[PDB]
Every structure is written in C-alpha cells, then in structure tokens.
Amino acid sequence: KNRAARVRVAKGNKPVSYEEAHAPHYIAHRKGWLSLHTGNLDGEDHAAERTLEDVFLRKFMMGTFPGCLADQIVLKRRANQVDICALVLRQLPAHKFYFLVGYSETLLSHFYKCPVRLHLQTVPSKVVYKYI
Amino acid sequence: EKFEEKWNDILDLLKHMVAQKVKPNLQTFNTILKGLRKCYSLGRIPALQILREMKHIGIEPSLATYHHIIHLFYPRDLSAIKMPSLIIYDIMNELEGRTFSPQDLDDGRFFQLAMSVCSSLRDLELAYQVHRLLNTGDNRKLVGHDPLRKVY
Amino acid sequence: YYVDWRMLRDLKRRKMAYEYADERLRINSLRKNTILPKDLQEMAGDEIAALPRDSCPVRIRNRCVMTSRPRGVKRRWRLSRIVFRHLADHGLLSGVQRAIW
Amino acid sequence: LHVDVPKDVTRPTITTSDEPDTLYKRLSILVKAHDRAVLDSYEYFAVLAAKELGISIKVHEPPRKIERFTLLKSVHIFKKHRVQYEMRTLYRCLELKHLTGSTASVYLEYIQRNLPEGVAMEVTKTQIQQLPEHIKEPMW
Amino acid sequence: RKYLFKGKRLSIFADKAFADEPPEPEASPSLWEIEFAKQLASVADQPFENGFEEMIQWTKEGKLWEFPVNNEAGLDDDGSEFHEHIFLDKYLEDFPKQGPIRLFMELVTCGLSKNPYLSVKQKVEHIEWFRNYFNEKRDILKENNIAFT
Ligand SMILES: [Mg+2]
Numbered sequence: 001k002n003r004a005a006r007v008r009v010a011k012g013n014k015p016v017s018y019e020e021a022h023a024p025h026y027i028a029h030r031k032g033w034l035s036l037h038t039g040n041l042d043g044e045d046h047a048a049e050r051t052l053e054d055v056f057l058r059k060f061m062m063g064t065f066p067g068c069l070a071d072q073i074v075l076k077r078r079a080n081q082v083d084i085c086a087l088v089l090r091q092l093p094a095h096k097f098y099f100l101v102g103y104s105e106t107l108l109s110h111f112y113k114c115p116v117r118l119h120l121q122t123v124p125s126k127v128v129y130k131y132i
Numbered sequence: 133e134k135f136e137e138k139w140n141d142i143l144d145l146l147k148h149m150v151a152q153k154v155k156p157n158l159q160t161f162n163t164i165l166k167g168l169r170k171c172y173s174l175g176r177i178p179a180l181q182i183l184r185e186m187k188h189i190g191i192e193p194s195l196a197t198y199h200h201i202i203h204l205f206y207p208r209d210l211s212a213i214k215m216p217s218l219i220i221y222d223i224m225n226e227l228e229g230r231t232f233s234p235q236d237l238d239d240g241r242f243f244q245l246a247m248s249v250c251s252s253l254r255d256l257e258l259a260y261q262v263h264r265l266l267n268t269g270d271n272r273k274l275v276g277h278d279p280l281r282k283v284y
Numbered sequence: 285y286y287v288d289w290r291m292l293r294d295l296k297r298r299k300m301a302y303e304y305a306d307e308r309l310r311i312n313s314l315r316k317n318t319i320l321p322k323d324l325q326e327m328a329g330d331e332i333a334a335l336p337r338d339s340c341p342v343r344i345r346n347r348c349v350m351t352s353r354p355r356g357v358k359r360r361w362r363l364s365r366i367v368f369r370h371l372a373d374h375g376l377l378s379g380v381q382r383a384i385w
Numbered sequence: 386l387h388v389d390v391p392k393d394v395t396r397p398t399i400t401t402s403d404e405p406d407t408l409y410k411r412l413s414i415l416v417k418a419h420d421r422a423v424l425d426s427y428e429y430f431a432v433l434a435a436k437e438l439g440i441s442i443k444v445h446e447p448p449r450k451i452e453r454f455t456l457l458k459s460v461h462i463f464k465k466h467r468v469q470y471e472m473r474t475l476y477r478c479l480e481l482k483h484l485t486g487s488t489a490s491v492y493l494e495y496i497q498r499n500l501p502e503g504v505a506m507e508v509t510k511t512q513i514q515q516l517p518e519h520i521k522e523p524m525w
Numbered sequence: 526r527k528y529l530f531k532g533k534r535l536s537i538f539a540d541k542a543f544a545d546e547p548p549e550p551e552a553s554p555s556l557w558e559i560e561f562a563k564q565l566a567s568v569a570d571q572p573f574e575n576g577f578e579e580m581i582q583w584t585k586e587g588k589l590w591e592f593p594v595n596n597e598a599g600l601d602d603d604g605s606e607f608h609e610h611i612f613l614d615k616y617l618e619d620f621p622k623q624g625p626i627r628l629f630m631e632l633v634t635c636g637l638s639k640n641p642y643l644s645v646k647q648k649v650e651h652i653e654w655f656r657n658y659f660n661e662k663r664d665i666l667k668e669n670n671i672a673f674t
C-alpha cells in the first residue's frame with residue numbers, strides 16, 4: 001500500500017483541507033504547485049539552490065508564526081523578487097502581525113540578498129474541504 | 133529691546149555678505165522671514181520687500197518662503213477678522229500650475245497653513261485652488277507629515 | 285552543525301580541492317603531454333603526489349545536502365531519492381509531477 | 386476617483402541622442418513554462434502590447450518537452466517497485482520584426498517586468514549593421 | 526494693492542550678473558552639508574503609494590534588477606579587450622624562442638586564449654608560474670640540452 005502524502009481515512013471526524021485531501025498523483029491534475037520558480041524548466045540552472053531556499057523559507061515561517069498558519073505557504077519568485085503568500089489564522093492581535101511582517105521581511109532580505117515581501121490573507125478558521 | 137535696532141543689525145550682516153563677495157541662498161531669506169513672524173504687525177512691509185529682492189537676485193521662492201509670508205499676514209490669533217488681507221489669493225495665482233521640489237525644511241508646512249486660512253475666510257473656491265496645486269506634478273509629497281497631513 | 289561527521293569530512297575535501305585547483309592544474313599539465321623531457325615529467329609526477337591527499341578532487345562524494353546519504357542522490361537537486369520524493373509528493377517542487385503515460 | 390483627479394501628472398524625461406539607433410531585423414522571444422494556460426495568457430498580453438506599440442509579431446508553439454526519470458519507491462530493498470516523475474516544458478515563441486533599439490528596449494522591459502512566476506524568457510536579438518569600413522575597401 | 530512682485534525692495538543686494546561663481550563642492554561634503562541633505566529628503570519623504578513607487582525605490586537602491594535584463598550588468602573584466610584575452614604570446618618572450626619549452630608554452634597559451642572563465646590577470650599568473658618553474662629546473666633542463674633564460 002502507498003503511504004506517501006496520503007491523509008488516511010478515520011471515522012469521518014478528521015477535517016482535511018483541499019491540499020491534504022489529494023494524494024500525490026493529483027499534482028498537476030486537481031491541485032497545483034506550492035512553489036513557482038523557473039529552476040526546473042528545461043535548460044535552466046540553480047534548481048538545487050531554489051529548492052534549498054524553499055525548505056528553509058517554510059521552516060522559518062512556521063516558527064515565526066507559530067500556530068497561526070491555516071495552510072501551507074505559497075512561494076512565488078519573479079526576477080530576483082521573492083513573494084510569500086500565507087493563509088494565517090486570526091489568533092494574534094493585528095499590531096503583532098505588522099511587527100512579524102516587518103521583521104520577517106527585513107531578516108530574509110538580508111539573508112538571501114533579494115527583495116522579499118510577505119502577503120498575508122487572514123482566515124477566521126481553517127477551511128475544511130471534506131471530513132474523512 | 134528695540135525692533136528698529138534689531139532689524140538694522142540683521143541688515144548689517146547682509147551688508148557684510150556683499151562686502152565679502154558672498155551671495156545669499158534660499159535659506160538666508162527663509163531664515164529672515166521665519167524670524168519676522170514674531171512681529172506680525174510691523175513685519176508686513178519688510179516681508180514683502182524680501183520676496184521682491186529674492187526674485188531680482190535670482191533665488192526662486194519656495195513653498196516654505198510663502199509659508200512664512202502667510203503666517204505673517206494671516207495670524208491664527210487674529211481679532212481683526214472683519215477685513216482680512218487678500219494676499220493669499222495673489223499667492224495662489226502666482227503658484228497656479230507650478231511644480232515644487234524639496235528645497236527647504238518648511239516646505240511641508242505650506243499646504244497645511246494654506247487650507248487653515250481658507251477655512252477661516254470661508255472661501256471654498258480658494259480651497260479648490262490650493263488642493264488643485266497639491267495635485268499638480270508631485271506636489272502631493274509636500275502635504276506634510278503625520279501631524280499635518282490629517283489637519284489639512 | 286552539519287548532518288554527520290561524514291558530511292563534515294566531505295566539506296573539507298571540497299574546500300581543500302578549491303585551494304589546490306590551480307596548483308594541481310599547472311603541475312599536472314606538465315605531465316599530460318609528450319613535448320617536455322621525461323626527466324621533468326618524472327619529477328612533476330612526484331610534486332603532484334606530494335600535495336595533500338584531500339587536495340585530490342576524486343575523493344569528493346556527492347551526498348544529499350539534507351541527509352548526507354552517499355548514494356541515491358539526484359545531482360540536479362542534491363537530494364537523495366527519499367528526500368526528493370517527500371518534497372515532490374507534497375507539491376513543493378516547482379514543476380515536478382508524477383509520470384503517467 | 387470621482388471628483389479628485391490628478392491635474393498634470395509627471396512623465397519621465399526621454400531625451401533623443403545624436404547616436405544612431407540599433408536596427409533589429411528580428412527579435413525572437415522564447416518563453417517557457419510548466420503551464421500551458423499561463424503561456425496563453427502571456428501570449429495575449431504580449432501580442433496586444435506589440436500591436437498597441439506598432440510592432441509586427443507572429444506566434445507559434447514549439448513542440449513541448451517532457452523529461453522523465455525513475456526512482457526507487459521504497460526506502461530499503463523492493464527493487465522492482467519504482468516511482469516515476471516527469472517535468473513538462475511548454476514553449477511559446479513571439480517573433481518580432483523590424484524593430485529599432487529604442488522600441489525593443491521599452492517593449493522588452495514592459496513584457497519582462499510582467500513575466501509571470503514560473504516563466505523563463507530567452508530573447509534572441511538579431512541586429513543588422515553595415516560592413517566594417519576597413520572591409521569595405523580591399524587594402525594590401 | 527498688495528502686489529507680491531510690484532513695489533520697493535530692500536536693494537541691499539544687486540542683480541547677480543555673476544552667478545554661482547564658487548563651485549558647489551568647494552570642499553568635500555562636510556558633516557553639516559551631508560546632514561542637511563538628508564533632512565531635505567525627509568521633507569518630501571512620503572510612504573509608497575503603489576507597487577510602482579515601491580519598485581522605483583528598489584531600483585534606485587540596486588535591490589531590484591534593471592530592465593531589460595542584461596545578464597552581464599556590472600560584470601566588466603577590468604575593462605579588457607578581446608585582443609588582450611586572445612593574443613597572449615607577448616608574455617612568452619622570456620621563454621626560449623624555440624625548442625621543447627616553446628612548443629609546450631604554445632599549447633598553454635592557446636588554451637588560455639580559449640578560456641572565458643579567467644581574467645587576463647589570472648591568465649598571466651598561469652604563465653608566470655611556468656616561468657619560475659622552469660627557472661628552478663635549470664639544471665635538469667641543461668642535462669636534456671634545453672637552455673632556459
Ligand atoms: Mg547523526
């Protein structure tokens with residue numbers, strides 16, 4: 001049996017998001033890609049360096065916004081600009097988000113030497129695609 | 133103690149600026165007008181003379197330079213509201229359509245002060261001229277900072 | 285801290301090969317020809333031998349950057365098959381999908 | 386804005402030089418992406434932009450490339466059981482013609498600054514110039 | 526009546542027939558002039574109004590790439606020329622004019638001319654290394670009938 005990235009069935013009480021519900025074979029069919037860069041296109045270089053930055057950028061955002069992430073973040077690279085689009089729960093006060101945005105942007109712009117912007121869409125609570 | 137002595141002293145500094153072949157800049161005239169705002173009553177004739185001398189020399193009056201003339205001619209604590217001065221109308225005509233750049237540290241103050249005089253005079257046509265000047269070019273950048281942006 | 289002591293030894297091998305690259309190039313050039321006297325070539329054969337062993341660039345092994353796995357690595361991403369599949373099967377690699385045909 | 390509108394918006398300064406301008410006979414723009422729909426939207430934006438600036442444009446779709454590789458599915462043994470992965474590359478070629486160097490810089494900036502994420506461009510400018518003055522006349 | 530530019534003036538100063546005679550940088554910018562300029566910028570300092578104004582500032586600061594893209598922007602190899610990279614035989618004058626060493630150095634300088642990953646300075650360093658190497662091996666070369674320098 002295949003165990004890869006499959007949220008298995010319980011007794012109908014496990015909420016799962018759209019991203020979690022779909023197994024790997026639905027990638028490019030029902031669900032898209034969380035990161036969009038040009039490094040895996042044919043005749044393009046620096047796939048390894050873009051992929052390592054993604055791993056870190058995801059671990060950074062989880063720790064910097066602990067318990068405030070409704071879904072996995074979406075990374076969008078255009079030219080040298082990096083754009084982070086994160087669904088965040090409305091747990092923290094509003095002013096705290098302004099602090100963490102200023103901090104996380106400046107810190108990641110001086111770490112990778114690129115302009116990095118954070119885009120936050122706040123949800124009242126996690127969106128449930130289906131109960132499995 | 134005596135304004136006439138004080139004014140004659142400041143002029144003496146200006147006369148030594150010509151003896152030493154030193155040419156004045158915008159800040160020099162702006163500084164003199166900013167000092168004149170203390171003597172509202174007696175600084176009116178001196179203030180106009182400075183602006184005429186500014187153009188003859190070739191120094192271009194900036195938004196800050198008018199900010200001082202307005203303060204000197206339209207006092208906020210003005211008891212004599214019956215017959216206010218008409219200079220504000222002439223200034224706006226002079227500055228109609230012109231674009232201004234940062235050239236002094238009181239440029240932001242001009243726009244906030246101009247609207248205040250319009251509200252005191254209850255002239256909405258003048259308020260449109262002032263706002264219309266704010267929209268020409270990139271004048272929007274001289275509206276003012278947080279304290280003065282919300283007042284304007 | 286790197287993943288393990290094996291990745292640490294590999295990292296040092298990569299930094300000592302970069303230091304000795306020009307040197308090992310200039311000396312080894314004197315040997316890879318038939319135009320110079322064999323006496324010089326026999327002597328250059330020992331100058332290259334005398335350099336430290338970690339300067340040799342064939343002692344470098346490509347390891348998964350995240351798990352330090354010596355085999356199973358894909359050179360375009362520098363990840364093992366196990367780590368690559370975890371990122372690919374989760375939609376985190378840009379443009380990588382399963383191959384159905 | 387209903388009542389409040391800019392009066393005299395400031396526009397950049399464009400100064401005509403005395404140097405002659407480059408003459409591009411052709412300018413091929415090969416965009417690449419994993420997604421066909423993104424290329425269709427970019428093709429519409431780029432063709433509309435060219436037509437609005439007076440540039441002559443043609444578009445075709447070079448054949449797509451699919452790169453497939455196989456991996457071992459299990460962590461240990463079970464050799465016969467594999468998992469396969471592929472990366473798909475799609476192409477849209479925008480062939481422009483008879484462009485001066487000023488028209489090609491403004492156009493390329495405008496379309497490159499609006500290049501979607503995951504899209505790679507490969508501009509192939511083809512300049513036309515006279516013969517070298519030495520070559521023009523044989524000299525012994 | 527209250528004409529802004531019609532009437533008597535102070536007249537202490539005279540019309541500037543000569544204008545800006547002393548240069549603006551009479552001395553290297555002093556702390557007084559460097560700090561006043563920073564304050565003038567703050568006078569018109571307003572926050573970004575859209576993505577264009579943000580990108581404009583990033584470009585002026587070098588944070589954002591310039592467009593159209595130039596893959597060699599800021600990449601000048603010491604202002605060299607093609608002839609400097611390709612014709613390198615001027616540096617082989619110290620070496621023997623003929624013989625085995627010349628035949629070898631011909632191959633070395635041919636490869637260096639076809640090397641796009643090295644600057645001229647680095648290519649010259651490769652040649653200089655061989656000059657000192659053969660000088661050290663003068664005695665072994667003399668046994669083989671090769672005379673160096
Ligand atoms: Mg361990």
Ligand SMILES: [Mg+2]
Pocket residue numbers: 342344345
């Ligand atoms: Mg090996």
